[PDB]
Design an enzyme around this catalytic site. Sequence first.
Site, mmCIF file in Angstrom:
data_model
loop_
_atom_site.group_PDB
_atom_site.id
_atom_site.type_symbol
_atom_site.label_atom_id
_atom_site.label_comp_id
_atom_site.label_asym_id
_atom_site.label_seq_id
_atom_site.Cartn_x
_atom_site.Cartn_y
_atom_site.Cartn_z
ATOM 1 N N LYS C 175 0.834 -1.191 0.000
ATOM 2 C CA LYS C 175 0.000 0.000 0.000
ATOM 3 C C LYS C 175 0.883 1.260 0.000
ATOM 4 O O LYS C 175 1.365 1.689 1.059
ATOM 5 C CB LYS C 175 -0.867 -0.016 1.259
ATOM 6 C CG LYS C 175 -2.260 0.583 1.097
ATOM 7 C CD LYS C 175 -2.216 2.088 0.888
ATOM 8 C CE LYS C 175 -1.727 2.821 2.140
ATOM 9 N NZ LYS C 175 -1.592 4.289 1.844
ATOM 10 N N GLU C 251 10.630 1.880 10.416
ATOM 11 C CA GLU C 251 11.566 2.983 10.233
ATOM 12 C C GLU C 251 10.726 4.255 10.381
ATOM 13 O O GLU C 251 9.929 4.583 9.503
ATOM 14 C CB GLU C 251 12.230 2.888 8.853
ATOM 15 C CG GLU C 251 12.983 1.565 8.643
ATOM 16 C CD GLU C 251 13.241 1.198 7.178
ATOM 17 O OE1 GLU C 251 12.599 1.789 6.273
ATOM 18 O OE2 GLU C 251 14.095 0.305 6.933
ATOM 19 N N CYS C 285 13.540 11.733 5.584
ATOM 20 C CA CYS C 285 13.630 11.382 6.988
ATOM 21 C C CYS C 285 15.034 11.614 7.532
ATOM 22 O O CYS C 285 15.208 11.861 8.730
ATOM 23 C CB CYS C 285 13.266 9.918 7.172
ATOM 24 S SG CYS C 285 14.288 8.831 6.145
ATOM 25 N N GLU C 387 9.781 17.115 14.680
ATOM 26 C CA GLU C 387 10.130 16.964 13.273
ATOM 27 C C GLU C 387 9.204 17.824 12.397
ATOM 28 O O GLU C 387 7.979 17.691 12.456
ATOM 29 C CB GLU C 387 10.059 15.487 12.845
ATOM 30 C CG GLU C 387 10.487 15.243 11.383
ATOM 31 C CD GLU C 387 10.221 13.810 10.891
ATOM 32 O OE1 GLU C 387 9.151 13.244 11.203
ATOM 33 O OE2 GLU C 387 11.080 13.252 10.178
#
Lengths: 483, 483, 483, 484
Positions: C175, C251, C285, C387
Site C-alpha cells: 500500500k 523505520e 527522513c 520533526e
Amino acid sequence: SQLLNYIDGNFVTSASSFANINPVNGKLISDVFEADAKQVNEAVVAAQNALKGPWGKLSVQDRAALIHKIADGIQARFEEFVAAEVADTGRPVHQARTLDIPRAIANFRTFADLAKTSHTDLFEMSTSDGSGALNYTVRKPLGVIGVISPWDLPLLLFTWKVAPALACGNTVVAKPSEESPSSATLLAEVMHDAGVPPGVFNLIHGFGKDSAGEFLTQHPGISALTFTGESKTGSTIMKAVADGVKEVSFELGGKNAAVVFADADLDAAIEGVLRSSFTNSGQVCLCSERVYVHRSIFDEFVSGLKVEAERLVVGYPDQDGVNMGPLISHGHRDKVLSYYRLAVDEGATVVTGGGVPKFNDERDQGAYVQPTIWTGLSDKARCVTEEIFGPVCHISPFDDEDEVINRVNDSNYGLACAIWTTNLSRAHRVSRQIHVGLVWVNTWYLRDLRTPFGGVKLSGLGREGGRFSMDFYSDIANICIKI
Amino acid sequence: SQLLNYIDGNFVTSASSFANINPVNGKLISDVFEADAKQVNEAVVAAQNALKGPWGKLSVQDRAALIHKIADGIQARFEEFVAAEVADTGRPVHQARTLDIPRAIANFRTFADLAKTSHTDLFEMSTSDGSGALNYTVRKPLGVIGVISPWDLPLLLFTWKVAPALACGNTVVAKPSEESPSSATLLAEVMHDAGVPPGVFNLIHGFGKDSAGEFLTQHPGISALTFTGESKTGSTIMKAVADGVKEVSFELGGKNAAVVFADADLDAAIEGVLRSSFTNSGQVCLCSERVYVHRSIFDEFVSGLKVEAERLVVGYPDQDGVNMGPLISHGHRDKVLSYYRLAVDEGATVVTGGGVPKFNDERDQGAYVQPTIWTGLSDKARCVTEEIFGPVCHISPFDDEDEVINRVNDSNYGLACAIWTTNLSRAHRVSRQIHVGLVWVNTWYLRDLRTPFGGVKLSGLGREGGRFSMDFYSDIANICIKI
Amino acid sequence: SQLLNYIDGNFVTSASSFANINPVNGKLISDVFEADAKQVNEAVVAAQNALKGPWGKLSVQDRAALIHKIADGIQARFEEFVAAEVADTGRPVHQARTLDIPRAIANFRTFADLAKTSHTDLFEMSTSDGSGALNYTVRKPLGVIGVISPWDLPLLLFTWKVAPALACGNTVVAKPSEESPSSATLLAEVMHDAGVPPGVFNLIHGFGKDSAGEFLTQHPGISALTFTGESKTGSTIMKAVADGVKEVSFELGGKNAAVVFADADLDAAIEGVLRSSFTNSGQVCLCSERVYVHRSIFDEFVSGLKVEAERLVVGYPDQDGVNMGPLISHGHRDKVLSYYRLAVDEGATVVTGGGVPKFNDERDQGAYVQPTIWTGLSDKARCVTEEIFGPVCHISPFDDEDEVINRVNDSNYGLACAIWTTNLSRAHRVSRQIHVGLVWVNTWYLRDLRTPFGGVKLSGLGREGGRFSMDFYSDIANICIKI
Amino acid sequence: PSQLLNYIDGNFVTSASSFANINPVNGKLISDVFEADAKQVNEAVVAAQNALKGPWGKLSVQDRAALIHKIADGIQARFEEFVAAEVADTGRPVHQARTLDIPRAIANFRTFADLAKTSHTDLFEMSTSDGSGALNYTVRKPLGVIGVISPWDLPLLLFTWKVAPALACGNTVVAKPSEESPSSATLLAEVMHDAGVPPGVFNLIHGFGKDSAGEFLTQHPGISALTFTGESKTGSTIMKAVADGVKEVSFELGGKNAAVVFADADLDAAIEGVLRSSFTNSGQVCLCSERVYVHRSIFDEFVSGLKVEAERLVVGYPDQDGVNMGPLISHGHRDKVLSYYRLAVDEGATVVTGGGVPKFNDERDQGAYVQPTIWTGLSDKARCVTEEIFGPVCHISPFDDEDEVINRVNDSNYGLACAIWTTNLSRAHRVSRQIHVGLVWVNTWYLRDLRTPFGGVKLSGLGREGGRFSMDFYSDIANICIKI
Ligand SMILES: NC(=O)c1ccc[n+]([C@@H]2O[C@H](COP(=O)([O-])OP(=O)(O)OC[C@H]3O[C@@H](n4cnc5c(N)ncnc54)[C@H](O)[C@@H]3O)[C@@H](O)[C@H]2O)c1
Ligand SMILES: NC(=O)c1ccc[n+]([C@@H]2O[C@H](COP(=O)([O-])OP(=O)(O)OC[C@H]3O[C@@H](n4cnc5c(N)ncnc54)[C@H](O)[C@@H]3O)[C@@H](O)[C@H]2O)c1
Ligand SMILES: O=C/C=C/C=C(/O)C(=O)O
Ligand SMILES: O=C/C=C\C=C(\O)C(=O)O
Ligand code: NA
Ligand code: NA
Ligand code: NA
C-alpha cells in the site's frame, strides 16, 4: 587451424608450435604456439602493470558488471565453445552442452555476485588509556595470479580459477593444458571482445616442464600460483615457488571410493556408481576407482553394474545415445591400457571391458578404451591404490561399518567419497569419519559453488569456493586505529 | 640445570646435549638434550596415536575446559615462567611480566573460547528432480601439527601456534628455538600436571638443519607445519614438505617502515618510533628499521629521537629503570655489528649508537649492543633493505604522500607498517595503500587475537588469528546429502 | 489518468476514487481507486495462495533471475518512471533520473544477489550417548508481507521493502502513500509484463486509518508488517498487529542533527549541511533540521549557508538549474507554515526564508515554501525538537565536545547524525557516542545496501539492509538431528 | 517462614503488599513475597538508567565477561541452595533440577559471557563519485535498560536465558519473575550482590502481571526493550503496552506442539521419546508435545506401548526414589487442567490412561497432582487438540500419508516446535524443512545448543534469540560511515 597466445591485449604467435590432436580419430585439429620464457615474462609484466591501469580503478560494482559481460560473451557464442571442448577432448556433445559450458558461465556469474556481496570485519578493543582502538580488515587484490589447469574439464576448471581471481580485482596469467587449449583461446577472444583492459587476462600456451608452465611458476612477478593437476606436479610447483614464498592453492589427484551399504536403494546405487566410474570415460578427478559393497548385496550389485556398463554407448560425441567418448590422448591410452594389463597380472577378474573397442572406421585411429570392471584384488594391489584416470572400477566386498571406513581411509589420497545408504544415523555417522574433502550421500558430483572445495593429504592444500576463494584470491589486510 | 624432551607423556633425555647461554653475562644456564631423528619419529607416532585415544573423544566443551586448565597452570607458576624467559633472552623483567607471559596465557584462553563458539555452514540447493540437496560443512582436527618457533618472543609465539592447534583438537610436536628452550619446557610440565593425555603435546629440542627442526619438517606423519622465522628458512621448509603436500602457515621476516606525516603529534610519534625501533632491543619481527619523516619536521624528529634513545637504560633485566637488555646471543651480535659496519661503509651518518656499550662488569661477557640511529643512506642501501633484527632505525625525509607510499612498498617484504597522522582522511587513505598485512595508525604493536595476522610477499604465506586459525588448524570437510 | 489496484494478477478498480494532485501547480494528475476491506482481503488471500503455486516452487536461482527481470523491466521504461515520480512529487527531473529511479532498480538487483549468495549455519553438538547431534538452520519464506510506505522517496522506499520480501520468497500486499501512487502502479505493470505469477505481488491504493492501510494491518492473513512513516503511525500499527503477534519492522521519524567542529573543512561542511537540510525540499527522513556549529566558526558558517541557500533555485522540475521543487501537498505546506510561524513566536531570528515564494504563475497554485534558516532558539523550543519535514534548519553554537554530544542525544528520536571534522580521533571518538542508527562523517546520505539500517528510540524498531533484511523477511528454522 | 524481597539499586527492599509462595507438593506456605508497586518499579528503571553511566558502563568487554563468569561461579558455589529453591517452588523432581535446571542457568551466563568476548562486527568499503571512497563500519552498543518478564515452567533457566545476554551486551536489567516461582531469582539477586555487580545493573521486582509490577514495567518509558516469555495472549497485551514508546520486543509464546511417528521409526525409542516429550515436568514445558500423529500401520501398537510406559511413571515427591513426575505448579493451574480433562471426555475422547488425580493418602493429597493422560478418538478440530493445555497429556491420532500429516501438524495458530521419528535419511530432511515451526527435532526432544537461533512462528513468537541473535537483539547496532 591455429591457437595463439593472448598477451597485453594482443594475440601473438611464437617461435615454436605443437600439434593439438582430436582423440576421436587422431586427426590434427590445430597448431598451438608455445609461449617461451620471454613471452611469459611479457605476460606477467603486463599483468603487473594492468593492476595500476583502469582495471584497478573499477568499483566492485563495475568490475562485477564487466565479469557478467564476459559471461554474456560466452553465452553468445555458446555453440562455438561446445564445439571447441568437444574437438579437443572427444567428450559427448550433450555433456558439453549441459555440464561443461553452462558451469563455466556459472563460475563467472557466481564469483561476480560473491564479490558484490562480500564484506570484511570490525573489531573494537580497549586500551590502557581508556580511549580504545579499532581494528578493521579489507580485501585487496592479491596481485598477479598464475593459473595452471588440467585437461579433464578444460573450460570448467579453467574458469573455476580465473573467475574468482578476476572477481577479486587480480590480474591473470593462465596456462591451459596442452591437451585442451581451444576453449581457453575462445575465452581470450571473449575477454577481448568484452573490452577487458589489456593485460588483465593473459593466455599462454605450452607444456609444463621446461615450458610455459614451469616459466610461470618460476616468475618472481606473480603473487600466487593456483593449480589443478597431478599430485607430483603440485609438489614440483610447491618447490618452484618456495623461494618467492608465493601463495599456493592445490587441487590434486585422488583414488576415490564409493561405498554401498546393505540398506542402499540398490538400483540407484548401481546407477550412481556407473555415473561416478565412467563419466567422461572416468577422466574426472572426482571419479570413483574403488568401490566397496556390503557382502549381502555384493554379487547382485556387480551383476547389475556389468549389465549397465555393457549398455553404455562408446562412440562419436554426436552419435545418438552416446555415453562415452575416447580418452584424451594416445599416450594416455597407453598408460591406461598398461594398468588394464597390470590388473590382470595382479590377479584381477575382468568382469567387463579390459581392452579397446573395435569400430572399423576412423575411430580405430583414435584413443578409445572400454568401460572396465575388476573384482578379486586386494587392498594393497597397485590398481586399487594408484590413480588410473580411466573408465574403470574395482569392486570389493565388506562386512562391517568400521572396517570399510578404515579401508576407504587407508590411502595417501583424500579427495572425495560417495556413500549409499537410506539410514539417517548411518549417513551422518559414517560421512563425518571419511578422511576426504567432499562426501556425497546418495549422489555424485553435485556442486554448489559456495561450498568449500578441496582435498586432504596428497589430494591437495587449501580450500576454494565461496568465501574461501574470496579469501585466497585477496590480500586480507588489518588496519588498527588508535583512538 | 637440564631441559628434557617431552615425548608421549614422559620427560626424556637424549644422546647429545647443547648449551643454553645467558646473553646478559655469557654464563651457562642449562644443558638441553637434542632430539635425534629417532626421537622425532617417536614423537610424531605418539601424536598420531593420541588422536585415536581419550583426546580424540573429548567434547569441544571438555577440550576447552582442559585448555583453560593449561592456562591456569601457567598462571599458577607465573613467576617461574617470567624467570625462564628472562634467563634465556635477557629481556627486561617488566616486559616478561606484562607482555610475554600474560599474552602466552591469553593465547590459550582465547582459542579455547573460539573453539566453544565456532560453528560452520549450511548450504541448501535445488536439484533437477526437485527434491533438493543439503550441503553442510564440519571442522575436524587436521591431524598432527608440527610447530617450529623463533626466539624473539619465545613463549608468546610458541603458544600462538600450540593453543589453536590444541583448540582444534589436533595433537602437536613442537620444536622451540635452541636459543630459548626454557619456557617451552616449563609449558610441557604444566601440560603434564594438568593431565593432558600422553602424545597430545610433544616437545622436542634441537636445531634446524640436520637436527630436530629438519627432521620434523621431513616426517611424513605430520599433516601441517606452522612456522615463524626467517624468510629463507620458510622457503627451505616449503621445499621440505612439498612432496607430502602438507598444509603450511608461514610468518616470516620484515623490513617494516614507520611514516611520520607533518600533522602527526610529534612527541607521540617520537615516543612511538622509539618503542617500535628499540623494544626487545629491536628483536621483534614487528619492529621498525626504516623510518620516513616529513621534510618539514625531519630535523626536529631526529633530534628528539636521539635524545630519547640516549635516555634508554641498557642493562640487567631487573635493573631499576631498564629499557633494553642484550641481543639473544654472541652469534646474533656478530651479525648485528657486521651491519653496523656496513652502514658506515654505505655512507651513513651515525646519529647515535653504532657500537657496543662498555659496562666494565660481567655484562661485557654478554651480548649487548647500543641502540642505533642512522641517516643519509639511499633507498637502495643494503642497511635500508635487509632485515637486521637489532635495535636500529634509519631515518629519511619525504615531501609527498604518494612518494612515501611508494618508498614504503618498494620492498620484497610486507609484514607491518606504522603511520603517524592526526588527519581522519589521511589515516584511512594512506593505510589502505600500504602493501603489508598490518597497519597501525598512531600506535604500534596493539594486538587483538581475533584479527587476521600475517604478511605479504616474503613476509609470509596465509593468515592466522581468529577464524583464520580455526580454519588453518582444521580439516574443513563438506558433506553433501541428496534428499 | 487512472490508477488501478493490482490484485491476483488483475488490474481492478474500486467503489470510490481519490484525486492525485500535482504539487507544482495544484492540477489534477489522476484518479486513484481506493481499495476497500473486501479487496484487501482478496489481496491477502491471493498472496497466501500464491505461496502454494509456481512461485513457491522456484529455486533461489530462478527466483533471483525473475527479480532481475523486474529490474530490467523498470530500466526498459526508465523515463516513464521518472515522469511518474516527478508528477506526484514535483521533485527535480535530475534528482529522479539520478537518485530515485536508479536506486529503486538497485534495490531489486542487490536483494536478488543477496538471495543467491546467502547461506545458513551448522552447529555440531555432543550428547550423553556419545553419538552426538547436528543442528542446522534454514531460511524459509515468512509468508505474506504487508508493506506500507511513505511519500518522501516513493519508489525507492517502496522497493526497499518489496525487493527483499520477494527475494526471500515471500508474497506481498503493498500500500503506497496516497500522495505518491503513480510509480508503484507502474511497478505493478512491470511485474505483470515480467510474468510474476498472480498473487505474488499485490498493489492496493488508499489512505491509512479507516482505509486500505488500516485494513492491511488488521488482516490476520499477513505474517509481517514492514513500515516506514511517522512514529505515531508506527505505534498505531504496532497495536493493530499485536493480537496476531505479526513480525514488525519500523523505520519512523527523526529530528536529526549536524555537528560542525572548528577543524571541519568549512566550505565542505556548508555545502554538506545545505544538501542535508534542503534536499527534496527538506522532505527526507534523514534530513538535518538541527545544526550545531563550534563558536569560532558559527558566524562565518551561518553567513556562508545563508548565501548558498539564497542561490538555491526553487521551481519547475525541468527548469534548467532547479534545486528544489514544492512540498508534497497543500496540507503538508500548511503544517510546515504553521511551524514557520511557531518559530517566530518562539523567538527565532529568520536568517533567510520563512515564507512562500511569489512566482506570479501557476506555481503559486502549488505547494512551494522557501528554504529557511533559524537562529536564536533554545534546545527546548518545539521547533528544535519536533520533526517539521520541511526545508528548514536551526543553527546553534556550541563550545565543548561532551556538551554538543549531550545536546545531540537529548531527543526522543535517534535516526541519524552528520559530523564534520578533519580530526582522526575526534571522528571515531564522537561518532560512537551519538545515540542514533547511522552517523556520517564528512558526508551525508551515503547508502550501502549491505549495511544494517534503522533507528533507535522513537525512530524505529529493528534493522533492515543486507543480512538483516534476509533475516527479517525469512522464517529462520532450526532442525536438530540426533545421530 | 521465609521472605522474598525485591532488589533495587543494590539493596534488598520490602513492599507495602506481600503474597504467598505455596509448595505445590503439599499446599504448605514456603515464603512471603513482597509485591513491588509503581513507585518501586520506577525506582528500579531509574537506577538501571543511572547504572549505564556508572562503572558498569566503563568495563571493557573482557572485564564485563570476567564478572559474568563470577556470577556463574557464585551460582555453582551455592548449587544445592539453588536446587532446593527451584524444587520448593515448583515440585519438580530433584534430579531434573540437578541435571537440567540449575546447570543450564549457569551455562547461560557462561555461554553469553564467552560470546561477548568473541563477537565482532562488520566492515563495508564503498566507492564514491570523487573516487576517494568511504568506509562503513558497525558497532554493538548496549541497547539500554532491558525489562525481563519470565514464566514459571523453567524458572531460573528461562530467567537467566534473558538476563545473561542482556548483561553480556552491557545492558542493565529490571527483571520480574513469575509470581509462581520467585525463589531462585531472589537467590540470583544475592549472588549478583555478593559478586560485586554494581548497584542498578541488576534489579529484581516481584509481583503479578495486570495492575502489578509486570504491567508497570512494560509501561515505563525508561526501558529500551521488553523481552518476554509466556502465554500468547500476554504477548499481545505487552506488545500493545510498549507500542507508544516503540520499544524493542522479543517474545517466546505458546505452542501446541506435535510429535510425528513414521512407520519406519525405531518404535521403542519413539515411545520413550514421546513419553518424555509429553510428561516431562508433568507436561508443563512450552516445548512439550500434546498432539501426536502415528502412522496407521503402527498406531495400535504405539498406543498400547505408550500406555504401558505411562502407567509405570512414578508420580510423587521431588526426592522420591525413581520419581518421574511431580505436581502441577498450583491448585489454580490444576483446576484449569482438570477442566480440560472433562472437556476431552465431553468431546468424545477415549481415555487410554489417566484422566484424573492420583490418591496418595498422605500430604500429597493436599498438593496439586494430576495423572499423566493419553487420549484418542478426537478430531483435528477438537478444542483439546488445538488449545494449549500445559499439563501431562497427549492425544494420539493415526495418519496415512506424509503430505497429509505435514498439513495436519501445520494446521495450527501456533508454531513453536515439533519432533519427528524416522530412520530414513531422506525423510528426516524432507519432512523437517516443511514443518512450520521454529524448532524441529528428529529422533529426540529438547536438545538445546545455546548458539542456535530459537523462537516460534505465528502465535508462538516474534523474533529469535540465541547465539548471534541474542547478541544482536540486546545491542544497539550502529553504523558509522566515513567519507575518505
Ligand atoms: N583435485 C581436483 O579438484 C582436480 C580436478 C581435476 C583434475 N585433477 C587431477 O589432475 C590430473 C589430471 O591430469 P593432468 O595431466 O591434467 O595433470 P598434470 O599434472 O600432468 O598437468 C596439469 C597442468 O599442469 C601443467 N604442468 C605439468 N608439469 C608442470 C610443471 N613441472 N610446472 C608447471 N606446470 C606443469 C600441465 O601443462 C598442465 O597444464 C589428475 O591427477 C586429476 O586427478 C584434480
Ligand atoms: N526511518 C526512516 O527511514 C524513514 C524513511 C522515510 C520516511 N520516514 C518518515 O515518514 C514520515 C513522513 O511520511 P508520511 O507522512 O507518509 O508518514 P505517515 O505515517 O503519515 O504515512 C505513511 C504511510 O502509512 C499509511 N498510514 C497512515 N496511517 C495509517 C494507519 N492508521 N494504519 C495503517 N497505515 C497507515 C499512510 O497511508 C502511508 O502509506 C516522517 O516522519 C518521516 O521521517 C522515515
Ligand atoms: O530508508 C530511509 C532513507 C534511507 C534511504 C535509502 O537509501 C534506503 O532506505 O535504503
Ligand atoms: O526457551 C523455551 C524452553 C526452554 C529451551 C531452552 O533451553 C532455552 O530457551 O534456552
Ligand atoms: Na640464548
Ligand atoms: Na501529492
Ligand atoms: Na510456589
